[PDB]
Amino acid sequence: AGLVPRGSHMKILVIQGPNLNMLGHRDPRLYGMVTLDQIHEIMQTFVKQGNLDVELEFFQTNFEGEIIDKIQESVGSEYEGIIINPGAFSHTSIAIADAIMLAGKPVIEVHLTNIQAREEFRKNSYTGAACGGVIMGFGPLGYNMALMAMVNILAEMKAFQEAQKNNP
Amino acid sequence: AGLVPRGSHMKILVIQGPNLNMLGHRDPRLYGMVTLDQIHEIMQTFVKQGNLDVELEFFQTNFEGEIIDKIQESVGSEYEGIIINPGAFSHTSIAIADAIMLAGKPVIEVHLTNIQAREEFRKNSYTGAACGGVIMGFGPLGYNMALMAMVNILAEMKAFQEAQKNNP
Ligand SMILES: O=c1c2ccccc2oc2ccc(S(=O)(=O)N=c3[nH]nn[nH]3)cc12
Ligand SMILES: O=c1c2ccccc2oc2ccc(S(=O)(=O)N=c3[nH]nn[nH]3)cc12
């Protein structure tokens, strides 16, 4: 008793789906040539500026199967929550949505654009329905909003579980 | 020149739509009896904790027309941005969506629940499509996320407009 110091390395996995790696090379003039690496740096700076004890891991892929593999690799292993932008797969991938459903951890969906405001085929998100919450239309800023939420959620889950939940 | 001290009273209007006033009296056991007034207090505390120079005004109504009147009253007058939860009107009110479209200021939509994860009739948001961005499924926390975003947006709009934009 009293032998386990606190508190948190929170470990959050950020999964980016198809085409996002081309940000700032084709577009966005919409955010003035911000790149995907730059969004990731922005998230790291958010952590630093808040003096938060958070470890971020970043992963981008154009493959549905690589997204599912990555979600599965997190289930047994260390990552406490996932921030995901499945991009265009959000509207079609029942398989990714099911993988999220049974990930056993909080998952937050982010989109750069307001997918509710575009073509009819972009309005549906199977994956969004599986996630706890969805953020859309804030550009890179949306990712910092997702991080703010995830830190709150993971900090409160600990409080409950331990100290309270249990003092072995 | 140099005769106008800076910087910000940001004035943000928070508009809550139908049934939300009954939070914590019928539900949410979903958030343990949090009331609508309590959400508003949470937002005020967010401002205080960040030492932000932000003024919040709160308004709840069960009337579509009162929401439109309130949006209009902001156009000519002082409020720099709107955070809105139109609730069940989101799925049906073209009129509120049009009022948002021409509000001439940033408008962010928030829902407590993940409306993408419920009945088919709740998935559509006319109002969400009109807003710059949408946040759903974070409970009260979503409102603090909306505030974080709005402060960023309004701070950057000033930088541009003034100093840069213009030094009369
Ligand atoms: O805006 C972009 C974008 C711009 C330049 C080059 C590549 C790009 O890839 C993207 C991928 C996803 C998104 S997204 O707005 O984050 N998600 C979407 N879901 N369905 N459609 N969009 C925006 C984008
Ligand atoms: O969860 C509630 C709620 C619980 C107890 C009593 C009244 C309530 O009113 C609400 C009003 C709106 C929402 S809402 O999830 O923020 N927005 C919705 N749009 N369409 N359906 N829901 C949740 C709610």
Coordinates of C-alpha atoms and ligand atoms in Angstrom, one line a residue:
Chain A
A1 CA 0.0 0.0 0.0
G2 CA 1.3 3.5 -1.1
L3 CA 3.9 1.7 -3.2
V4 CA 2.7 2.8 -6.6
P5 CA 3.5 6.5 -7.4
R6 CA 1.1 8.6 -9.4
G7 CA 0.0 9.7 -11.8
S8 CA -0.1 9.6 -15.5
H9 CA 1.6 8.7 -18.6
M10 CA -1.5 8.8 -20.7
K11 CA -0.7 7.1 -24.1
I12 CA -2.9 8.2 -27.0
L13 CA -2.8 6.8 -30.5
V14 CA -3.7 9.1 -33.4
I15 CA -4.7 7.2 -36.6
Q16 CA -5.0 9.2 -39.9
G17 CA -6.8 7.6 -42.9
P18 CA -6.5 7.9 -46.6
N19 CA -5.2 10.9 -48.5
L20 CA -4.4 13.0 -45.4
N21 CA -0.7 12.6 -46.0
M22 CA -1.0 14.9 -49.0
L23 CA -2.2 17.9 -46.9
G24 CA -0.2 21.0 -47.8
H25 CA 1.1 19.6 -51.0
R26 CA -2.2 19.7 -53.1
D27 CA -4.3 21.5 -50.5
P28 CA -5.0 23.0 -48.1
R29 CA -4.8 26.5 -49.4
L30 CA -7.8 26.0 -47.1
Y31 CA -5.4 26.2 -44.1
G32 CA -2.5 27.8 -46.0
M33 CA -0.4 24.8 -46.7
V34 CA -0.5 23.1 -43.3
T35 CA 1.0 19.6 -43.6
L36 CA -0.1 16.4 -41.7
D37 CA 3.3 16.4 -39.9
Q38 CA 2.5 20.0 -38.8
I39 CA -0.9 18.9 -37.4
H40 CA 1.0 16.3 -35.3
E41 CA 3.5 18.9 -34.1
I42 CA 0.5 21.2 -33.1
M43 CA -0.8 18.3 -31.0
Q44 CA 2.6 17.8 -29.3
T45 CA 2.8 21.6 -28.6
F46 CA -0.7 21.4 -27.0
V47 CA 0.6 18.7 -24.6
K48 CA 3.7 20.7 -23.8
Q49 CA 1.9 24.0 -23.3
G50 CA -0.5 22.3 -20.8
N51 CA 2.5 20.5 -19.1
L52 CA 0.5 17.3 -19.6
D53 CA 1.9 13.9 -19.1
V54 CA 0.8 12.5 -22.4
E55 CA 2.6 10.4 -25.0
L56 CA 1.3 10.6 -28.5
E57 CA 1.9 8.0 -31.3
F58 CA 1.0 9.0 -34.9
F59 CA 0.0 6.6 -37.7
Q60 CA -1.2 7.4 -41.3
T61 CA -2.3 4.9 -43.9
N62 CA -4.3 4.6 -47.1
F63 CA -5.3 1.0 -46.2
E64 CA -8.5 0.0 -44.4
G65 CA -6.8 -3.2 -43.2
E66 CA -3.9 -1.3 -41.8
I67 CA -6.3 0.9 -39.8
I68 CA -8.0 -2.3 -38.4
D69 CA -4.6 -3.9 -37.6
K70 CA -3.5 -0.8 -35.7
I71 CA -6.7 -0.6 -33.7
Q72 CA -6.3 -4.3 -32.8
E73 CA -2.6 -3.9 -31.8
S74 CA -3.8 -1.2 -29.3
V75 CA -6.4 -3.5 -27.6
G76 CA -3.7 -5.6 -26.0
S77 CA -1.0 -2.9 -25.4
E78 CA -0.6 0.2 -23.6
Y79 CA -2.6 2.8 -25.5
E80 CA -5.4 4.2 -23.3
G81 CA -7.4 6.0 -26.1
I82 CA -7.6 6.6 -29.9
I83 CA -8.2 9.8 -31.9
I84 CA -9.1 8.7 -35.4
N85 CA -9.8 10.4 -38.7
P86 CA -10.9 7.6 -41.1
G87 CA -11.5 10.2 -43.8
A88 CA -13.4 8.9 -46.8
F89 CA -13.6 5.4 -45.2
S90 CA -15.9 6.8 -42.6
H91 CA -18.9 6.7 -45.0
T92 CA -18.3 3.1 -46.1
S93 CA -16.3 1.0 -43.7
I94 CA -18.5 -1.2 -41.6
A95 CA -15.4 -3.2 -40.8
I96 CA -13.5 -0.2 -39.2
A97 CA -16.7 0.8 -37.4
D98 CA -17.0 -2.7 -35.9
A99 CA -13.3 -2.6 -34.9
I100 CA -13.9 0.6 -33.0
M101 CA -17.0 -0.8 -31.4
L102 CA -15.0 -3.5 -29.8
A103 CA -11.7 -1.6 -29.1
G104 CA -12.5 -1.6 -25.4
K105 CA -11.3 2.0 -25.0
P106 CA -12.5 5.6 -25.8
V107 CA -12.3 6.5 -29.5
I108 CA -12.9 10.0 -30.8
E109 CA -13.5 10.8 -34.5
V110 CA -12.2 14.0 -36.1
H111 CA -12.7 15.5 -39.6
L112 CA -11.0 18.6 -40.9
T113 CA -14.0 19.6 -43.0
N114 CA -17.6 19.8 -42.0
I115 CA -18.7 16.6 -43.7
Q116 CA -22.4 17.5 -42.9
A117 CA -22.0 20.5 -45.3
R118 CA -20.8 18.7 -48.4
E119 CA -21.9 16.0 -50.9
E120 CA -24.8 13.7 -49.8
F121 CA -22.4 10.6 -49.9
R122 CA -20.2 12.3 -47.2
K123 CA -22.9 12.9 -44.6
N124 CA -23.1 9.2 -43.3
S125 CA -20.3 8.1 -40.9
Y126 CA -20.4 4.4 -39.9
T127 CA -17.3 5.0 -37.9
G128 CA -18.6 8.2 -36.2
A129 CA -21.7 6.2 -35.0
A130 CA -19.3 3.7 -33.3
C131 CA -17.1 6.3 -31.7
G132 CA -18.1 8.0 -28.5
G133 CA -18.0 11.5 -30.1
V134 CA -17.3 13.3 -33.3
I135 CA -15.7 16.6 -34.1
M136 CA -15.9 18.1 -37.6
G137 CA -15.2 21.4 -39.4
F138 CA -12.5 23.0 -37.3
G139 CA -9.5 22.1 -39.5
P140 CA -6.3 21.3 -37.5
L141 CA -7.8 22.9 -34.4
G142 CA -10.2 19.9 -34.2
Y143 CA -7.4 17.6 -33.3
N144 CA -6.5 19.8 -30.3
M145 CA -10.2 19.7 -29.3
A146 CA -10.1 15.9 -29.5
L147 CA -6.9 15.9 -27.3
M148 CA -8.5 18.2 -24.7
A149 CA -11.5 15.8 -24.5
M150 CA -9.4 12.6 -24.4
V151 CA -7.3 13.9 -21.6
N152 CA -10.4 14.8 -19.5
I153 CA -11.9 11.4 -20.2
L154 CA -8.8 9.3 -19.4
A155 CA -8.1 11.4 -16.2
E156 CA -11.6 10.7 -14.9
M157 CA -11.5 7.0 -15.8
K158 CA -8.4 6.6 -13.6
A159 CA -9.8 8.5 -10.6
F160 CA -12.8 6.1 -10.7
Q161 CA -11.0 2.8 -11.4
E162 CA -8.1 3.1 -8.9
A163 CA -8.1 5.0 -5.7
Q164 CA -11.9 4.8 -5.8
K165 CA -12.3 1.5 -7.7
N166 CA -10.0 0.0 -5.1
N167 CA -4.9 -0.2 -2.2
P168 CA -4.3 -3.8 -3.4
Chain B
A1 CA -2.6 56.2 -33.4
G2 CA -1.9 54.0 -30.4
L3 CA -5.0 55.5 -28.7
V4 CA -7.1 52.3 -28.6
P5 CA -5.9 49.9 -25.8
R6 CA -6.1 46.1 -26.3
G7 CA -7.2 43.5 -26.3
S8 CA -10.4 41.5 -25.8
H9 CA -13.7 41.5 -24.3
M10 CA -14.9 38.6 -26.5
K11 CA -18.7 38.3 -26.2
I12 CA -20.1 34.9 -27.0
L13 CA -23.8 34.0 -27.1
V14 CA -24.8 30.5 -26.1
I15 CA -28.3 29.4 -27.4
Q16 CA -29.9 26.2 -26.1
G17 CA -32.9 24.7 -27.8
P18 CA -35.9 22.7 -26.8
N19 CA -36.1 20.4 -23.8
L20 CA -32.6 21.1 -22.6
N21 CA -33.9 23.1 -19.6
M22 CA -35.2 19.7 -18.2
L23 CA -31.7 18.3 -17.8
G24 CA -31.0 16.8 -14.5
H25 CA -34.7 16.7 -13.5
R26 CA -35.8 13.7 -15.8
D27 CA -32.3 12.8 -17.1
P28 CA -29.4 12.7 -17.3
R29 CA -28.7 9.9 -15.0
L30 CA -26.5 9.8 -18.2
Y31 CA -24.3 12.6 -16.6
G32 CA -25.6 12.0 -13.0
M33 CA -28.1 14.8 -12.7
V34 CA -26.1 17.6 -14.3
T35 CA -28.6 20.6 -14.9
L36 CA -28.5 23.1 -17.8
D37 CA -27.5 25.9 -15.3
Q38 CA -24.6 23.7 -14.2
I39 CA -23.4 23.3 -17.8
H40 CA -23.4 27.2 -18.0
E41 CA -21.5 27.4 -14.7
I42 CA -18.9 24.9 -16.2
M43 CA -18.4 27.2 -19.2
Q44 CA -17.9 30.2 -16.9
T45 CA -15.4 28.3 -14.9
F46 CA -13.5 27.3 -18.1
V47 CA -13.2 31.1 -18.8
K48 CA -12.0 31.8 -15.3
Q49 CA -9.5 29.0 -15.1
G50 CA -8.0 30.2 -18.4
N51 CA -8.0 33.8 -17.2
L52 CA -9.8 34.6 -20.5
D53 CA -11.4 37.9 -21.3
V54 CA -14.7 36.5 -22.4
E55 CA -18.2 37.4 -21.6
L56 CA -20.9 34.7 -21.9
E57 CA -24.6 35.2 -22.4
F58 CA -26.9 32.2 -22.0
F59 CA -30.4 31.8 -23.6
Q60 CA -32.7 28.7 -23.6
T61 CA -36.0 28.3 -25.4
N62 CA -38.5 25.7 -26.7
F63 CA -39.5 28.0 -29.6
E64 CA -38.0 28.0 -33.1
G65 CA -38.9 31.6 -33.5
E66 CA -37.2 32.7 -30.3
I67 CA -34.0 31.1 -31.5
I68 CA -34.3 33.0 -34.9
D69 CA -35.1 36.2 -33.1
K70 CA -32.0 35.8 -30.8
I71 CA -29.7 35.1 -33.7
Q72 CA -31.0 38.2 -35.5
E73 CA -30.6 40.4 -32.4
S74 CA -26.9 39.4 -32.3
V75 CA -26.2 40.4 -36.0
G76 CA -26.5 44.1 -35.1
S77 CA -25.1 44.0 -31.6
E78 CA -21.9 43.2 -29.8
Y79 CA -21.8 39.3 -29.9
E80 CA -18.8 38.1 -31.8
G81 CA -19.8 34.4 -32.0
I82 CA -22.5 31.9 -31.2
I83 CA -22.4 28.4 -29.7
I84 CA -25.8 26.7 -30.4
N85 CA -27.5 23.5 -29.5
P86 CA -30.7 23.5 -31.5
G87 CA -31.5 20.0 -30.2
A88 CA -34.4 18.3 -32.0
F89 CA -34.8 21.3 -34.3
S90 CA -31.5 20.6 -35.9
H91 CA -33.1 17.8 -38.0
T92 CA -36.0 19.8 -39.3
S93 CA -35.5 23.6 -39.1
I94 CA -34.4 24.9 -42.5
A95 CA -35.4 28.4 -41.1
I96 CA -32.9 28.2 -38.2
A97 CA -30.2 26.9 -40.6
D98 CA -30.8 29.8 -42.9
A99 CA -30.6 32.3 -40.0
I100 CA -27.2 30.8 -39.1
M101 CA -26.1 31.0 -42.7
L102 CA -26.5 34.7 -42.8
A103 CA -25.6 35.5 -39.2
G104 CA -22.3 37.1 -40.4
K105 CA -20.3 35.5 -37.6
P106 CA -18.8 32.2 -36.5
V107 CA -21.4 29.7 -35.2
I108 CA -20.5 26.3 -33.6
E109 CA -23.1 23.5 -33.1
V110 CA -23.0 21.3 -30.0
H111 CA -25.0 18.2 -29.1
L112 CA -24.7 16.3 -25.8
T113 CA -25.4 13.0 -27.4
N114 CA -23.8 11.5 -30.5
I115 CA -26.7 12.1 -32.8
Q116 CA -25.0 9.9 -35.5
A117 CA -25.4 6.9 -33.2
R118 CA -29.2 7.0 -32.6
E119 CA -32.5 6.9 -34.6
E120 CA -32.3 7.5 -38.3
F121 CA -34.4 10.7 -38.0
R122 CA -31.7 12.2 -35.7
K123 CA -28.7 11.8 -38.1
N124 CA -29.5 14.8 -40.4
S125 CA -28.6 18.3 -39.1
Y126 CA -29.7 21.1 -41.4
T127 CA -28.3 23.5 -38.7
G128 CA -25.0 21.6 -38.4
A129 CA -24.5 22.0 -42.2
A130 CA -24.9 25.8 -41.9
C131 CA -22.5 26.0 -38.9
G132 CA -18.8 26.2 -39.4
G133 CA -18.3 23.1 -37.2
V134 CA -20.1 20.5 -35.1
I135 CA -19.3 18.7 -31.9
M136 CA -21.4 15.8 -30.7
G137 CA -21.3 13.0 -28.0
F138 CA -19.1 14.6 -25.3
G139 CA -21.9 15.5 -22.9
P140 CA -21.3 18.9 -21.0
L141 CA -17.6 18.7 -22.0
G142 CA -18.6 19.4 -25.6
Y143 CA -19.6 22.9 -24.6
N144 CA -16.1 23.6 -23.2
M145 CA -14.6 22.2 -26.4
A146 CA -16.8 24.7 -28.4
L147 CA -15.6 27.5 -26.1
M148 CA -11.9 26.5 -26.7
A149 CA -12.5 26.6 -30.4
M150 CA -14.5 29.9 -30.4
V151 CA -11.8 31.7 -28.4
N152 CA -9.2 30.6 -30.9
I153 CA -11.3 31.6 -33.9
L154 CA -12.2 35.0 -32.5
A155 CA -8.6 35.8 -31.3
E156 CA -7.2 35.1 -34.8
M157 CA -10.0 37.1 -36.6
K158 CA -8.9 40.1 -34.6
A159 CA -5.2 39.8 -35.2
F160 CA -6.0 39.7 -39.0
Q161 CA -8.7 42.5 -39.1
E162 CA -6.9 45.1 -37.0
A163 CA -3.2 45.6 -36.5
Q164 CA -2.8 43.7 -39.7
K165 CA -6.1 44.6 -41.5
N166 CA -5.1 48.2 -40.9
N167 CA -3.7 52.6 -37.2
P168 CA -6.7 54.6 -38.4
Ligands
LIG1 O1 -8.8 18.6 -46.9 C1 -8.3 17.4 -47.1 C2 -7.2 17.3 -48.0 C3 -6.6 18.4 -48.7 C4 -5.5 18.1 -49.5 C5 -5.0 16.9 -49.7 C6 -5.5 15.8 -49.1 C7 -6.7 15.9 -48.2 O2 -7.2 14.8 -47.6 C8 -8.3 14.9 -46.8 C9 -8.8 13.8 -46.2 C10 -9.8 13.8 -45.3 C11 -10.4 15.1 -45.0 S1 -11.7 15.2 -43.8 O3 -12.5 16.4 -44.0 O4 -10.9 15.2 -42.6 N1 -12.6 13.7 -43.8 C12 -13.4 13.4 -44.8 N2 -14.2 12.5 -44.7 N3 -14.8 12.4 -45.9 N4 -14.4 13.3 -46.7 N5 -13.4 14.0 -46.0 C13 -9.9 16.2 -45.6 C14 -8.9 16.2 -46.5
LIG2 O1 -30.1 14.3 -23.0 C1 -30.9 15.2 -23.2 C2 -32.0 15.4 -22.2 C3 -32.1 14.6 -20.9 C4 -33.1 15.0 -20.0 C5 -34.0 15.9 -20.3 C6 -34.0 16.7 -21.4 C7 -33.0 16.4 -22.4 O2 -33.0 17.2 -23.5 C8 -32.0 17.0 -24.5 C9 -32.1 17.8 -25.6 C10 -31.1 17.7 -26.6 C11 -30.1 16.7 -26.5 S1 -28.8 16.7 -27.7 O3 -28.2 15.3 -27.7 O4 -27.9 17.7 -27.3 N1 -29.4 17.1 -29.2 C12 -30.3 16.4 -29.9 N2 -30.6 16.6 -31.1 N3 -31.5 15.7 -31.5 N4 -31.7 14.9 -30.5 N5 -30.9 15.3 -29.4 C13 -30.0 15.9 -25.4 C14 -31.0 16.0 -24.4

